[PDB]
CSV table of C-alpha atoms and ligand atoms in Angstrom, one decimal:
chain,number,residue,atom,x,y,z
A,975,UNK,CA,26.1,0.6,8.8
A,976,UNK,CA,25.6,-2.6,11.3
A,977,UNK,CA,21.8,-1.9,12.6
A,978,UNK,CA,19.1,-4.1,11.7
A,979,UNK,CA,15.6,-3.9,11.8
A,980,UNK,CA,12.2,-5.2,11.1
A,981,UNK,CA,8.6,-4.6,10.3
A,982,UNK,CA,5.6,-5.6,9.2
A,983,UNK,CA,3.4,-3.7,6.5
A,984,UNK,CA,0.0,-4.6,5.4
A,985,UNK,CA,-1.2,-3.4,1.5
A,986,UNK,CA,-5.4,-2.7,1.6
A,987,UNK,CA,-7.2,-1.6,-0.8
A,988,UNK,CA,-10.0,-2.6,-3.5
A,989,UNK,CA,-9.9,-5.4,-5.6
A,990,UNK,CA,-7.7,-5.1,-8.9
A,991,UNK,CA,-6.1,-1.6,-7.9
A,992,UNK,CA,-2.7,-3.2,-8.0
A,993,UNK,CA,-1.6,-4.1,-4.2
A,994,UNK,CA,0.1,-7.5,-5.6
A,995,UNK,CA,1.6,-5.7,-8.2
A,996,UNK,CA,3.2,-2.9,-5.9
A,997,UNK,CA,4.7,-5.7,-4.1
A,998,UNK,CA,5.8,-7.7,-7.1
A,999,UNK,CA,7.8,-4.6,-8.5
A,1000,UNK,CA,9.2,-3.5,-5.0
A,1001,UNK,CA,10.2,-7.4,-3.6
A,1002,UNK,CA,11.1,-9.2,-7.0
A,1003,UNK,CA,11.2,-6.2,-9.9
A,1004,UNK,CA,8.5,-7.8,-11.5
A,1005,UNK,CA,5.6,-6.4,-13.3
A,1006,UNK,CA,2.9,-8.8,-14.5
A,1007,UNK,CA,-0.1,-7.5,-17.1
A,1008,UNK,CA,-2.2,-10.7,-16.0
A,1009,UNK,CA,-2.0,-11.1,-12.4
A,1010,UNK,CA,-4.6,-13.2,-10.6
A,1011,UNK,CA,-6.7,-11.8,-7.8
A,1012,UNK,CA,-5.1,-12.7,-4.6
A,1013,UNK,CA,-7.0,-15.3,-2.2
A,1014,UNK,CA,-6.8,-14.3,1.5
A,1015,UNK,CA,-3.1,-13.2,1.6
A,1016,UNK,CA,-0.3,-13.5,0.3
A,1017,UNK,CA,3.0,-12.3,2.2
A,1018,UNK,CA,6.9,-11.6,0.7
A,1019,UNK,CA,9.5,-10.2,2.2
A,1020,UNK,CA,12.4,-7.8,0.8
A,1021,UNK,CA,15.6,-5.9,2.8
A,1022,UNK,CA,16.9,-2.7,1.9
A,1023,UNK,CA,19.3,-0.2,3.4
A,1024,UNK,CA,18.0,2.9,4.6
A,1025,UNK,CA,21.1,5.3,6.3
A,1026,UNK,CA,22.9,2.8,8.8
A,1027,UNK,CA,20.3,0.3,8.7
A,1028,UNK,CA,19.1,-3.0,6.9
A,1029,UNK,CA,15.3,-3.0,6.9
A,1030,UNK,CA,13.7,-5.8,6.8
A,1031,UNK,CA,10.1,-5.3,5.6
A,1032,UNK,CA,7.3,-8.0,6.3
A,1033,UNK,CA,4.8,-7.8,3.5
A,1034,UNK,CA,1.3,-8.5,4.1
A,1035,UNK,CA,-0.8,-8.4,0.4
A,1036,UNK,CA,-4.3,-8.5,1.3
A,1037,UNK,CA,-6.8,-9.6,-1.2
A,1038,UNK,CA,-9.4,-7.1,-1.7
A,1039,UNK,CA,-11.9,-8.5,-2.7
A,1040,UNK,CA,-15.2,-7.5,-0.6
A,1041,UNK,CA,-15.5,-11.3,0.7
A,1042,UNK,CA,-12.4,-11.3,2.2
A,1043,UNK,CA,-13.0,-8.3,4.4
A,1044,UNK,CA,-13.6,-10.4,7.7
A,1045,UNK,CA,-10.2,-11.4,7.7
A,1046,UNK,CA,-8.3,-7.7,7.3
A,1047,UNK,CA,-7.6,-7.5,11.0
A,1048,UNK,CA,-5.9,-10.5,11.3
A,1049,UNK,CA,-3.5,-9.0,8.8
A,1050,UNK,CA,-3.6,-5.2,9.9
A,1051,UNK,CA,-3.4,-6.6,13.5
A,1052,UNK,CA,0.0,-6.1,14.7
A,1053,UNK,CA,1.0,-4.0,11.9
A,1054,UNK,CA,3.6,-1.2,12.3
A,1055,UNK,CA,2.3,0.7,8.8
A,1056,UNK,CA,-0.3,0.0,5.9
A,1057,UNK,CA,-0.5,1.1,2.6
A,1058,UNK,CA,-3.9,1.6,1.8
A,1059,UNK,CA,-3.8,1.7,-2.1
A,1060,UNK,CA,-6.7,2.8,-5.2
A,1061,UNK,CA,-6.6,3.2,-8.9
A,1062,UNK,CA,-6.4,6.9,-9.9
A,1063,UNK,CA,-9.1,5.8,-12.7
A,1064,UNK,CA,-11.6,4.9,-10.4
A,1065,UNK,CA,-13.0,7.3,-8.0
A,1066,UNK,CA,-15.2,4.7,-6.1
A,1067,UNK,CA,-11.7,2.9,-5.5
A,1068,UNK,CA,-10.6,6.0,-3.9
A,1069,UNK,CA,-13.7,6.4,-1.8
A,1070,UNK,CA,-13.1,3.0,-0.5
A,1071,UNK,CA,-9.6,3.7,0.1
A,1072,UNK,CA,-10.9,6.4,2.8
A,1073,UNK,CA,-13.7,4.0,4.5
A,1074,UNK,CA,-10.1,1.1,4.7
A,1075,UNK,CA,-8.4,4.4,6.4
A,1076,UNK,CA,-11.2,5.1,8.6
A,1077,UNK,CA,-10.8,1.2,9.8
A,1078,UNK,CA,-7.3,1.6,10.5
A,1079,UNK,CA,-7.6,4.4,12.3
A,1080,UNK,CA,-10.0,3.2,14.9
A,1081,UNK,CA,-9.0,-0.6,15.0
A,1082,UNK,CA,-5.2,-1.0,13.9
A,1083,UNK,CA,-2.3,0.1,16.2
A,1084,UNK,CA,-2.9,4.0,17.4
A,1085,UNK,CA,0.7,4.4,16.1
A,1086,UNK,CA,0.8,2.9,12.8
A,1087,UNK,CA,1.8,4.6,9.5
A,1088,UNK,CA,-0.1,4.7,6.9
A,1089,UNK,CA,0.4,5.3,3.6
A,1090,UNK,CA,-1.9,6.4,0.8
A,1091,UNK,CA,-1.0,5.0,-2.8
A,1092,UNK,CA,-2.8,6.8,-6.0
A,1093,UNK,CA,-2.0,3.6,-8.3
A,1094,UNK,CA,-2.0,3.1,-12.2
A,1095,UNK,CA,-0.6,6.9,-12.3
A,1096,UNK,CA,1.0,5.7,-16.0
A,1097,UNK,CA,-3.2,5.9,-16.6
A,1098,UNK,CA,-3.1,9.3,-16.4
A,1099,UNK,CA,-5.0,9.8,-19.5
A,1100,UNK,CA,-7.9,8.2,-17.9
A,1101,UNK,CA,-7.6,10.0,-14.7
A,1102,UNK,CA,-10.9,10.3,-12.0
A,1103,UNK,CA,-9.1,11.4,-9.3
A,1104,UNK,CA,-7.3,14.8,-9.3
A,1105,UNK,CA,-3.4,14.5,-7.3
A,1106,UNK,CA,-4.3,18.1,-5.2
A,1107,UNK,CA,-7.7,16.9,-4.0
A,1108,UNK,CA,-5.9,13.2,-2.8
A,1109,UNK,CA,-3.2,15.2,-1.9
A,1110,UNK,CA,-5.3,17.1,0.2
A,1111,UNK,CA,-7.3,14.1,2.1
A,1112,UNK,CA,-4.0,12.4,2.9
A,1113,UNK,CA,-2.5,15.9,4.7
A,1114,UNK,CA,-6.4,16.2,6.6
A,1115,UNK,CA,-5.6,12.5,7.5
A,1116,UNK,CA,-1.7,12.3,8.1
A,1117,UNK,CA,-1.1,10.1,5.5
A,1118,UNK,CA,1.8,9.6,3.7
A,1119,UNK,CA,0.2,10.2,0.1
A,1120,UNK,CA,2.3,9.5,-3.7
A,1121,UNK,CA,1.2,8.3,-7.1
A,1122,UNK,CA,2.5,5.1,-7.8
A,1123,UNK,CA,2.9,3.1,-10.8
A,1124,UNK,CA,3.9,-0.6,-10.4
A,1125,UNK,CA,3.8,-0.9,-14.0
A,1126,UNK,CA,6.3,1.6,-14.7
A,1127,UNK,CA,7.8,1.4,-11.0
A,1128,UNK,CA,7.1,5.2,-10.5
A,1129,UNK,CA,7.1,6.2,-6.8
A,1130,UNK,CA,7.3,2.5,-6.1
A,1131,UNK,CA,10.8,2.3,-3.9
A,1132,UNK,CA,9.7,5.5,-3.1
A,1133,UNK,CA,6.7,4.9,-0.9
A,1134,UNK,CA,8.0,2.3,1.1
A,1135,UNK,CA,11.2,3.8,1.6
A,1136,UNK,CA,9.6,6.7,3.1
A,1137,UNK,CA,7.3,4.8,4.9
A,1138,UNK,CA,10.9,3.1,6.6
A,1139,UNK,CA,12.3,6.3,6.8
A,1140,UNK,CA,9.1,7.5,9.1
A,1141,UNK,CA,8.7,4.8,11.5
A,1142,UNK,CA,9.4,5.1,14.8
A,1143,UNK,CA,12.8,5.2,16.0
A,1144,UNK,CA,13.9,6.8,19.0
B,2374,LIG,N1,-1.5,0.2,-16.1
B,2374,LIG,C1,-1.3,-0.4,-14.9
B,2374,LIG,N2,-1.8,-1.6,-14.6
B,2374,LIG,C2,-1.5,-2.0,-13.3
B,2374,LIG,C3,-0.8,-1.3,-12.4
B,2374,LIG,N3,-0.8,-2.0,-11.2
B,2374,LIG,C4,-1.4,-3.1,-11.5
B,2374,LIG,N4,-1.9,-3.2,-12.7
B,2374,LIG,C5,-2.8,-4.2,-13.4
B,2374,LIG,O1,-4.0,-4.2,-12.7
B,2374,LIG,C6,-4.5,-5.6,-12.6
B,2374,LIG,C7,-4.8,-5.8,-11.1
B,2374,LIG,O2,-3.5,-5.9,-10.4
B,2374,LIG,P1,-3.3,-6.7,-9.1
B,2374,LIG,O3,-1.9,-6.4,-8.6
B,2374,LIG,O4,-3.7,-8.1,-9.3
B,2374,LIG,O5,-4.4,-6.0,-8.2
B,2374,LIG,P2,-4.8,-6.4,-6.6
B,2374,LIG,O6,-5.0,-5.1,-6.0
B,2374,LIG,O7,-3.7,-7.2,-6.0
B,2374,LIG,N5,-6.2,-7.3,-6.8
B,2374,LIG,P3,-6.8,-8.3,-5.5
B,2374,LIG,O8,-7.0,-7.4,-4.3
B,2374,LIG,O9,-8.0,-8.9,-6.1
B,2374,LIG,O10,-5.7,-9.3,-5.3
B,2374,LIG,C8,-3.5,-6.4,-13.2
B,2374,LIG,O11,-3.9,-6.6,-14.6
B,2374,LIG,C9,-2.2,-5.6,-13.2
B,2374,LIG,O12,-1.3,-5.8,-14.3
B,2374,LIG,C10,-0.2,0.0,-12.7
B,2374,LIG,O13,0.4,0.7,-12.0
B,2374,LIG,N6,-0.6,0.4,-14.0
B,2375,LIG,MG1,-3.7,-9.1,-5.2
């Protein structure tokens, strides 16, 4: 089909949960086992088609670390969705996950979409936070909720695609 369009996403989430790895293995196919810890931000950019339309996705991949927290808004600012992202192995990852939604739902764009990724999911064996419970916080929060691997790449066109497929259009 011959419709374009754009937006801009912004990943958020505890350090070393796997944001720049999400990216990496949605924009480039890429999986890295030693990945540094981002500084800032780092931003990419892929297109796909979705139905009649060529989606361009603006990638915002925040560094999570807790000294960078100051300068979220300037990257959540203007954004159209977020996916705020944990490691299912780490239950205090997932509590900050819901204190990152809580500032995106009274400081970002009343109409954004958010997303809520359960990362490391190929860590199963290792698991701290049960799918239904997750599951049920994202549906109490309207949040668009998978497990994801970027390791694997399980759930990881997936999620964005349905974020796409969700945003506003008409
Ligand atoms: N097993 C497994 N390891 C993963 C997965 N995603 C990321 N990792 C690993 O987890 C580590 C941290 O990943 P990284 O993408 O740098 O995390 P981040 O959230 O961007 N960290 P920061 O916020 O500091 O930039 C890396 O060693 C990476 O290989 C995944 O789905 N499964
Ligand atoms: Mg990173």
């Amino acid at each position: 089909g011959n419709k374009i369009c754009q937006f801009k996403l912004v990943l958020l989430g505890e350090s070393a949960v796997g944001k720049s790895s999400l990216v990496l293995r949605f924009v480039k196919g890429q999986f890295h086992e030693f990945q540094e810890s981002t500084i800032g931000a780092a931003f990419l950019t892929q297109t796909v088609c979705l139905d009649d339309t060529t989606v361009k996705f603006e990638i915002w991949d925040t560094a999570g670390q807790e000294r960078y927290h100051s300068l979220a808004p300037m990257y959540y600012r203007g954004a159209q969705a977020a996916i705020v992202v944990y490691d299912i192995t780490n239950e205090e990852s997932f509590a900050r996950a819901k204190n990152w939604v809580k500032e995106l739902q009274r400081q970002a764009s009343p109409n954004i979409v958010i997303a809520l990724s359960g990362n490391k999911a190929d860590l199963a064996n290792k698991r701290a936070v049960d799918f239904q419970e997750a599951q049920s916080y994202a549906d109490d929060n309207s949040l668009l909720f998978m497990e994801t691997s970027a390791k694997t790449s399980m759930n990881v066109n997936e999620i964005f695609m349905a974020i796409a497929k969700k945003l506003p259009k008409n």
